[PDB]
Amino acid sequence: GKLTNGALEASNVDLSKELVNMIVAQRNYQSNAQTIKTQDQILNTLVNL
Amino acid sequence: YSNEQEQVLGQIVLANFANNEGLASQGDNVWAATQASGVALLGTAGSGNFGKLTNGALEASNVDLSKELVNMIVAQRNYQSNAQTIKTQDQILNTLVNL
Amino acid sequence: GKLTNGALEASNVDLSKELVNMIVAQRNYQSNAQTIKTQDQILNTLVNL
Amino acid sequence: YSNEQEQVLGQIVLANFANNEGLASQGDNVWAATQASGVALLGTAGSGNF
Amino acid sequence: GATAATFSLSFLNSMQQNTGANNIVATNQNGYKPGDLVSYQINNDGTVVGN
Amino acid sequence: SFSQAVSGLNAAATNLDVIGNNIANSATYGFKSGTASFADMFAGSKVGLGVKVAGITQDFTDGTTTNTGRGLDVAISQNGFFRLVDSNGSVFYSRNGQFKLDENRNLVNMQGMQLTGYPATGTPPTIQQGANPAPITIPNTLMAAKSTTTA
Amino acid sequence: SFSQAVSGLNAAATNLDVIGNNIANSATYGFKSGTASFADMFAGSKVGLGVKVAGITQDFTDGTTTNTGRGLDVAISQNGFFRLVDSNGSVFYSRNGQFK
Amino acid sequence: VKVAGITQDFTDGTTTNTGRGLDVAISQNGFFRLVDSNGSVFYSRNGQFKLDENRNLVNMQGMQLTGYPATGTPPTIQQGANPAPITIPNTLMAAKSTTTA
Amino acid sequence: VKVAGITQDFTDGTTTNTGRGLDVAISQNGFFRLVDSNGSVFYSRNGQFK
Amino acid sequence: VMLPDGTSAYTRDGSFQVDQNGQLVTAGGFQVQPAITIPANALSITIGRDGVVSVTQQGQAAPVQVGQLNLTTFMNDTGLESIGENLYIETQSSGAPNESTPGL
């Protein structure tokens, strides 16, 4: 492609999509943490036997 | 190309199985054909029993986390109930041994 | 490697993974202590016989 | 290397046994070949049964 | 070179009254072209139906 | 006695492991959820010895088709599987559409398995469906000229 | 098994870090966003051992072209990469066109 | 004391949707009829049916679901026929010359 | 009773990412082949190399 | 199972191993009849409900059968004489060994 003079190319990062993906990834992380807690309670129950 | 002319280089083939659930998962989100899955039937998209391809798009997973976060609760309760049964049998054996 | 002036190299310790490893090691330690307790009970039965 | 040229220095060999169980463990997460396990069949990773 | 299809064509139930204009209400036929399996399902009453 | 509750605990653990695997793959293109199938284990006596895990069944339902805007993301709606080949020549199948153009000009996925398809032969090249699938490649090979035969 | 949950947590953390890095570079000339690609790691059994990050894929789509009024800034359209060399002769490539 | 017997509790359970087209459940009374590879006939309430390699409808353990087959052109449920294992063939369905219009 | 044997369970374990370039994990079947100072041949699945 | 003397013993324990030659043996090292040989490059062993033993090889589109595991029944089970190592041998009070397919 040709070169544009007197201009700069900005980043292609859209903030809205990034924020929504951050929300979704936070929720997924908390779900995995809940799974970890579930396994913790299972192991605690077995040890307390 | 640059001479305003298109050239075909290949056509994506699609495989369908008699038994999808018989496929063995090999990791890397990749399945392997097995005798239970049957022989792979090859074909082209949009013909026969093959769906069309959507270009520029990706197929996301079908995991519904609300449903899974519920399930997990049920399985935890079932596991704890089974552990309760285990401890009951343990107390039974202790009672018989203490004689 | 290259030297960067005016900057400091922070530690490469991530807190989340370390916390999870702490949880797993706690569970392993408790299971091993349960094994120790089991062995303590078998020798008791024999000694008493 | 620094001359934008690379040099192969070896290829890690993998061993497969006719009876994986017959292996006699020597500790240090290390196994030793045994008559029960048979001779070791050597090969390259990602090929054949490896 | 295929055998021509001989069929009984019936105009039953048809009528001639003071309608808006001469129009066809319905047409039906029991023949079909070759078709390959596309889908299968189990109906409410238990019948297995392939589309 | 003990084996009954042992089998129950093992089945519950397998179910929890399947659920955890499903959660860990919440955002994984081409992933299908799994579910454990359980069955009874009666053996002569009516007391119901225990339970066993008959297997793991996938749920081969279409996921959401999300637009990414790349030209190498392709999603299979309804039934179908992409066919891939590794370096050994083993044939695999996957629903993922994250294909990348490698250094050798072949269409491969993230893990490097080469996408397969019907090749084009002849001049002008046309898809010959009578041949076996071959890895798809995109060479830069300049296109030669064609002297005119019909105007 | 703890392994699947740990792998899922690590993958979520990696994705969140990628998203945060993309956010931090919203105003950065010549930056291309990134996306983590995940893959499962079934190993022999059918229990779904866990997940892994197969890699991080760039998004090489052209960004918006903003005029600055200086003659020494050059924006690049469509495909192409600016070629640079360091003090040691190594060759590098960049889409950032801010020169002096 | 003597264990008189073991009585099953044949009450209807909860019907949970799964979204699979080969997945079916029985409300009220009735049992699915299955056949083993040796020809022994069994009955089960479980409805996890899947298509096997040979295009027959089998459950998880491999017992073939049985039912009234279809004969004729067009095929019809033969209520007077003995139950047979259900098969879903993928064979090409031929054309029928038009007879009535 | 008599101890008939001590059998191993050679099922593949989880592949845990660490980030060291000298660490190698074995998928499916195969063993790493090692030698000590005495030339004895050993086999190990542990892939923490230095 | 075949004893080293060439005579046949009968066992119910099913923990089978493979020797250096590739054959199926009992965990006590005794070779179980019929002679079922597992090849060197085997990926997965599938033993069906009827005793059909199959293996899948790399690059081979179809699984390969390497034998058929049969079950022996006796009209009088108690009369079998134990020789240790989870093994029973046939006596005259244990009837005669009847070989059959597992499901017949």
Swiss-Prot record, chain G:
Localization per record: Bacterial flagellum basal body
Domain of life: Bacteria
Family indicated by similarity: Belongs to the flagella basal body rod proteins family.
Name the UniProt record assigns to this protein: Flagellar hook protein FlgE
Species per Swiss-Prot/TrEMBL record: Salmonella typhimurium (strain LT2 / SGSC1412 / ATCC 700720)
Record gene name: flgE
Residues of the full protein shown: 2 to 101 of 403
UniProtKB/Swiss-Prot annotation, chain J:
Gene Ontology CC terms, in alphabetical order: bacterial-type flagellum; bacterial-type flagellum basal body, distal rod
Record key words, sorted: Bacterial flagellum
Domain of life from the UniProt record: Bacteria
Keyword Transferase (UniProt): no
Main location: other
GO biological process: bacterial-type flagellum-dependent swarming motility
Subcellular location per the Swiss-Prot or TrEMBL entry: Bacterial flagellum basal body
Keyword NADP on entry: no
Entry's family note: Belongs to the flagella basal body rod proteins family.
The protein's assembly and partners: The basal body constitutes a major portion of the flagellar organelle and consists of four rings (L,P,S, and M) mounted on a central rod. The rod consists of about 26 subunits of FlgG in the distal portion, and FlgB, FlgC and FlgF are thought to build up the proximal portion of the rod with about 6 subunits each.
Annotated protein name in UniProt: Flagellar basal-body rod protein FlgG
Source taxonomy: Bacteria, Pseudomonadati, Pseudomonadota, Gammaproteobacteria, Enterobacterales
Residue numbers of the full-length protein present here: 105 to 208 of 260
